[PDB]
């Protein structure tokens, strides 16, 4: 049913790949004892404010700690950050887009 936000850590499972139509495929693995849980997802500008104008993958969740999650997103143009997870330990990747 309704899950709460993951409180654990996320690490990149593979390198971020981009598609022809300017989206990105993010593969993350999760560390935490609270799965199944909803994955905190966000994007930011260089300043740090949340863009999050679009997220293709609806309702990203960790169902099993041992299994990684695919998330597709549409970052803004130029330098931005993909942010997976919450808190001081959140996974923060830089990204650049044509």
């Amino acid at each position, epitope marked *: 049913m309704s899950y709460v936000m993951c*409180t*654990g*850590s996320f*690490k990149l499972e593979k390198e971020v790949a981009e598609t022809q139509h300017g989206t990105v495929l993010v593969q993350v*693995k999760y*560390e*935490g*004892t*609270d799965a199944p849980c909803k994955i905190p997802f966000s994007t930011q500008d260089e300043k740090g404010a949340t863009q999050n104008g679009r997220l293709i993958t609806a309702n990203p969740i960790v169902t099993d700690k*041992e299994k990684p999650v695919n998330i597709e997103a549409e970052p803004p143009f130029g330098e931005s950050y993909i942010v997976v997870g919450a808190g001081e330990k959140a996974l923060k990747l830089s990204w650049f887009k044509k």
Partner: antibody, heavy 117, light 108 residues
Framework: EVQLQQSGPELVKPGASVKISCKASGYSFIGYYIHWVKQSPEKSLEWIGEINPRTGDTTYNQKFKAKATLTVDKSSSTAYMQLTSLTSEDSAVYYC??????????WGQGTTLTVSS | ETTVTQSPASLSVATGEKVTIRCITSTDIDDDMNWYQQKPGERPKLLISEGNTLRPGVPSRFSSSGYGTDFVFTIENTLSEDVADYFCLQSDNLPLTFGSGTKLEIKR
């Protein structure tokens, strides 16, 4: 700081059972998996299994599935491992660990189990 | 399971020399390899976690590398304090599996 304190040495007869404890402190016990590791007299390390202290969910190594049983107690923040049907092959040093950053870390001091009559 | 073959079983070097230990995995594990030191009478301690990540407080003379199935652990300028057993642990999938260990000794 983070600490895992294991129970003392055990001398058990062949055929009997034993239950080693592992008291956690210095962090949210609920927040991290506890794993158990066996170290044989020949110094070889085998992974026994893991337990989620929040839900009690466990995953075992197939090699230890019929011998080991992992439990937890949120109240005393203590993880337990029970070994049944003991033989001299079970004589070894047993460690408990906290999995964090995907690695086994903050190992306990170990518990020496001797299976002899 | 993912089999981990470690070599050599035993190694001896003089103070200041390079130590090279290796672990080969039966399956592809990316860089999910970890390295542990165990001094006599002590418990294993994590020197290096996944992606050649040196643990805080661990001397910079310890390093690692590899991606896929071929993994190496290195000691630069080996000190006499470094005598111990060294183990690798694959953290890619369950069950977790260890290398059989390497015994390090000093030539003097």
């Amino acid at each position: 700081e983070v600490q895992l304190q294991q129970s003392g040495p055990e001398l058990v007869k062949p055929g009997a059972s034993v239950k080693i404890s592992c008291k956690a402190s210095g962090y949210s016990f609920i927040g991290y998996y506890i794993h158990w590791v066996k170290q044989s007299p020949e110094k070889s390390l085998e992974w026994i299994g893991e337990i989620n202290p929040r839900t009690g969910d466990t995953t075992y190594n197939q090699k230890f599935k019929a011998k080991a049983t992992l439990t937890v107690d949120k109240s005393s923040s203590t993880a337990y491992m029970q070994l049944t049907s003991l033989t001299s092959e079970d004589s070894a040093v047993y460690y408990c660990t906290k999995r964090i950053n995907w690695a086994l870390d903050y190992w306990g001091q170990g518990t020496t189990l001797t299976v002899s009559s | 399971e993912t089999t981990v073959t470690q070599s050599p079983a035993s190694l001896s070097v003089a103070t200041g020399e390079k130590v090279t230990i290796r672990c080969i995995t039966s399956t592809d594990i990316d860089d999910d390899m970890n390295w542990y030191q165990q001094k006599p009478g002590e418990r294993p301690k994590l020197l290096i976690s996944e992606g050649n990540t040196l643990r805080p407080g661990v001397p910079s003379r310890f390093s690692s590398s590899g991606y896929g199935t071929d993994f190496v652990f290195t000691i630069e300028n080996t000190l006499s304090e470094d005598v111990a057993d060294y183990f690798c642990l694959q953290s890619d999938n369950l069950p977790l599996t260890f290398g059989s260990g390497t015994k390090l000794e000093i030539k003097r």
